[PDB]
Enzyme design. Structure first.
Site: not given
Ligand SMILES: [Y+2]
Ligand SMILES: [Zn+2]
Length: 390
Positions: A94, A96, A98, A131, A133, A254, A273, A279
């Site tokens: 999916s 995403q 953040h 957070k 990544e 991303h 998402r 979903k």
């Molecule tokens: Y991830």
């Molecule tokens: Zn990510």
């Protein structure tokens, strides 16, 4: 023991590859289950284990925080501040986003106030912080990351201008506001509006060649009815060669589409998402958490820094650090002021601490407590390290 060989969890999520971890690393899979993620760390839902009885790495750290993590990490974080995964994406995953620090605090609080359990499916915010990544390709790795330059989006949408008025609207004035409106409109398409747009796109897939049309074709086999099929026209499609990495910024769509990668992240994540999912998407919330600014392709990969045998991937955060170490038959010292996880990428590593020796074949990892730094590494190939620079 100074060095602990890790027993690591494999998450058998439906989208995992039935073969990747076996082909790469010799990880046993007689039942041919999909193997989606190999976890290296101390996550409370499935901690790695160490051995002479088998104990949770999380339980071991908890009884001896300063010794295992180091003073810095025990001070700043109070636990192992990273989770290190191998990701095997056999199907496209999916899109995403953040959220940033501020909105993470808010969404974490909203879900807490509503009493949503932390491990519930409905739960999107699991940390009051943003957070960071890092994704590092192990095999060739197809992904999307960030919005393309506006002139790129313009060129890519021309063949599908008739799919939706929001597309025409953006083409008329290709700016951030209208990009935002296009993104929301696409995600909100319903019924015959949606089916019309998808029919235009699929007609384009017959008369357009190469990327990103090819990526759309690939994605359509798994998400034939998804408005996220338009996303490779808005987002940079990237094929990482093995050894290349990207650092995923806040507020930036991303997706991982195919291949195997290492991922370094916090234990707890915030995820909204943005397509390629069955979903429900809260579109106003998503849109309020996205930055509609292009990111040029030349800026997508993180540029690492080589010093001696070490290749560091500098990360703009304190939570974790990531480096690759070229092994030679002569020993080299790998030291840090934190706990470290060492993972054999390829070749074979012999780790030495005084009288203790520990061999890691590809795919195997060891935990080194802060008290046990440094260790001497020799062999062939490369060792990846997650640790903390503080
Ligand atoms: Y991830
Ligand atoms: Zn990510």
């Amino acid at each position: 023991a100074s060095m602990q060989k890790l027993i690591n969890s494999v998450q058998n999520y439906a989208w995992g590859s039935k073969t990747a971890l076996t082909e790469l690393y010799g990880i046993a899979n007689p039942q041919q289950q999909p193997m989606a993620e190999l976890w290296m760390g101390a996550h409370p839902k499935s901690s790695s284990r160490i051995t002479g009885e088998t104990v949770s790495l999380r339980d071991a750290i908890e009884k001896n925080k300063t010794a295992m993590l180091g003073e810095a990490v025990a001070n700043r974080f109070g636990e192992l501040p990273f989770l290190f995964k191998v990701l095997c994406a056999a199907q496209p995953l999916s899109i995403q986003v953040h959220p940033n620090k501020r909105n993470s605090e808010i969404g974490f609080a909203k879900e807490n106030a509503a009493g949503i359990p932390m491990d519930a499916a409905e739960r999107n915010y699991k940390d009051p912080n943003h957070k960071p990544e890092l994704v590092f390709a192990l095999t060739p790795f197809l992904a999307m990351n960030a919005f393309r330059e506006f002139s790129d989006i313009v060129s890519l949408l021309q063949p599908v201008a008739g799919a939706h008025s929001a597309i025409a609207h953006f083409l008329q004035v290709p700016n951030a506001e209208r990009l935002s409106q296009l993104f929301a409109s696409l995600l909100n398409m319903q019924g015959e509006e949606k089916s019309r747009a998808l029919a235009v796109l699929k007609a384009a897939l017959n008369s357009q060649q190469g990327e990103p049309w090819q990526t759309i074709r690939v994605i359509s086999e798994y998400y034939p009815d998804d408005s996220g099929l338009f996303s490779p026209l808005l987002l940079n499609v990237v094929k990482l060669n093995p050894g290349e990495a990207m650092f995923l910024f806040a507020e930036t769509p991303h997706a991982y589409l195919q291949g195997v990668a290492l991922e370094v992240m916090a234990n707890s994540d915030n995820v909204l998402r943005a397509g390629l999912t069955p979903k429900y998407i809260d579109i106003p919330e998503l849109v309020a958490n996205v930055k509609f600014e292009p990111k040029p392709a030349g800026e997508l990969l993180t540029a690492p820094v080589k010093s001696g045998a070490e290749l560091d991937f500098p990360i703009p955060v304190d939570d974790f650090a990531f480096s690759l170490h070229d092994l030679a038959l002569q020993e080299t010292s790998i030291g840090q002021h934190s706990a470290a996880i060492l993972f054999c990428v390829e070749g074979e590593a012999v780790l030495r601490k005084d009288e203790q020796r520990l061999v890691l074949k590809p795919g195997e990892s060891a935990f080194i407590g802060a008290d046990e730094s440094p260790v001497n590494a020799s062999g062939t190939g490369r060792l990846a390290r997650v640790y903390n620079k503080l």
